[PDB]
Amino acid sequence: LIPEIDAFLGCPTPDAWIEAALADQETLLIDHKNCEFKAASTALSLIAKYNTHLDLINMMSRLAREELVHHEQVLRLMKRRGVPLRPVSAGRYASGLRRLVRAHEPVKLVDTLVVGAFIEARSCERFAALVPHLDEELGRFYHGLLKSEARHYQGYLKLAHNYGDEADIARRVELVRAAEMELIQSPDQELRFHSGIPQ
Amino acid sequence: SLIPEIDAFLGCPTPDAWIEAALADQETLLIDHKNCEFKAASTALSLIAKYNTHLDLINMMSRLAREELVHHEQVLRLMKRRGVPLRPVSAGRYASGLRRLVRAHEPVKLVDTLVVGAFIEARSCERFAALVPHLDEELGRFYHGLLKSEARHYQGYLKLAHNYGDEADIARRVELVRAAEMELIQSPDQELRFHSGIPQ
Ligand SMILES: [Ar]
Ligand SMILES: [Ca+2]
Ligand SMILES: [Ca+2]
Ligand SMILES: [Cl-]
Ligand SMILES: [Fe+3]
Ligand SMILES: [Fe+3]
Numbered sequence: 001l002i003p004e005i006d007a008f009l010g011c012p013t014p015d016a017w018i019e020a021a022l023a024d025q026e027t028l029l030i031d032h033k034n035c036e037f038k039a040a041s042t043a044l045s046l047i048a049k050y051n052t053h054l055d056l057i058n059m060m061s062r063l064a065r066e067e068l069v070h071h072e073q074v075l076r077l078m079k080r081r082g083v084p085l086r087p088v089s090a091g092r093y094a095s096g097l098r099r100l101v102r103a104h105e106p107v108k109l110v111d112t113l114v115v116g117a118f119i120e121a122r123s124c125e126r127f128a129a130l131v132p133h134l135d136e137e138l139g140r141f142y143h144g145l146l147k148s149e150a151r152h153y154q155g156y157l158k159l160a161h162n163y164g165d166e167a168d169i170a171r172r173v174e175l176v177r178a179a180e181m182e183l184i185q186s187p188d189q190e191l192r193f194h195s196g197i198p199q
Numbered sequence: 200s201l202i203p204e205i206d207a208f209l210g211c212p213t214p215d216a217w218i219e220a221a222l223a224d225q226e227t228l229l230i231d232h233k234n235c236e237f238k239a240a241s242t243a244l245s246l247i248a249k250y251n252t253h254l255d256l257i258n259m260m261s262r263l264a265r266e267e268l269v270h271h272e273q274v275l276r277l278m279k280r281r282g283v284p285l286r287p288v289s290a291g292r293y294a295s296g297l298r299r300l301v302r303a304h305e306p307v308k309l310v311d312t313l314v315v316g317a318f319i320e321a322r323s324c325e326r327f328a329a330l331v332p333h334l335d336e337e338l339g340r341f342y343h344g345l346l347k348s349e350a351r352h353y354q355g356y357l358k359l360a361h362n363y364g365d366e367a368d369i370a371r372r373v374e375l376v377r378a379a380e381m382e383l384i385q386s387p388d389q390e391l392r393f394h395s396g397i398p399q
């Protein structure tokens with residue numbers, strides 16, 4: 001039946017992450033841009049791995065295009081604000097959740113969609129936590145990305161139900177929710193879009 | 200210009216024997232074609248990732264990857280309409296063969312990479328044109344639409360190569376890749392792929 005975002009997620013965005021985010025918005029934009037690209041890139045890797053699953057390759061193709069549009073929009077905004085194309089490394093969050101995926105099919109694909117569901121759901125929750133504290137152009141932009149992150153969250157979770165049983169998915173969501181919550185609430189060395197509470 | 204017509208740019212036509220083999224196994228061709236649209240999209244995202252501060256490359260490669268993914272989806276709808284089932288079809292030797300000529304040191308590793316892109320796109324344009332007189336209306340219509348967009352991708356990939364390299368060093372790369380591409384398109388081959396040599 002698909003929970004609401006706050007119901008699906010193990011915790012809110014800590015007040016400390018947001019204080020850190022607002023002090024270093026150039027790093028945030030670069031990392032957001034990078035995350036839109038990794039989403040598209042991750043969707044293409046699933047098409048390559050599951051090359052004869054027609055229901056998956058169609059969704060992932062459309063989703064990869066959505067993510068690339070977002071990747072371009074964020075590059076547009078970066079130019080307007082003279083944010084320079086500076087190399088920012090990946091946070092621990094994405095690699096962190098994938099370490100949870102089981103090695104065997106057909107659970108490996110279910111687990112991968114659930115992790116996808118969490119990343120989308122957290123991005124939605126976190127954009128909304130930021131909007132009110134931002135300028136109008138950045139606030140209007142991030143408010144725009146909100147409805148599509150919720151849709152990508154619904155999409156990833158629906159696709160897991162297509163390829164696995166209600167019971168196995170409830171259990172996967174439970175294990176991931178906990179790992180995801182620990183990543184958000186733990187302290188972290190670097191302000192990323194999906195980083196923990198800064199030391 | 201430094202951007203020729205396609206037949207000028209290419210070092211040979213599509214052999215009639217490729218076409219004979221292709222018309223006998225159109226379903227394998229569709230599937231390989233679908234995999235090629237997809238691979239072109241992934242290849243573009245590799246270049247975004249590899250050259251993460253080349254702001255002109257990153258913008259164009261994002262736009263191209265979206266274009267290639269529309270083509271990927273269009274090929275999937277076509278296969279469905281015609282009851283062509285998905286099944287595993289391995290990559291042909293062609294793009295690997297070309298990638299092995301790419302020099303290992305920047306800034307020519309990039310230039311070389313984009314010239315290879317210009318040859319893949321040019322060949323596809325040429326081969327689509329060679330095929331469509333032989334196909335049914337729907338398939339011919341689809342491949343005619345694709346041929347227009349390959350031409351652009353070939354132009355784009357060559358202009359981008361000029362944006363990042365010396366005119367004389369491009370010409371010497373084009374000349375080298377041209378010869379190997381021809382060798383790959385003209386030599387015999389175990390398998391039918393969109394860019395296979397002459398099957399056996
Ligand atoms: Ar075909
Ligand atoms: Ca909650
Ligand atoms: Ca500055
Ligand atoms: Cl698009
Ligand atoms: Fe997005
Ligand atoms: Fe998304």
Ligand SMILES: [Fe+3]
Pocket residue numbers: 236239266267270348
């Ligand atoms: Fe294409």
Ligand SMILES: [Fe+3]
Pocket residue numbers: 239267320348349352
């Ligand atoms: Fe193309």
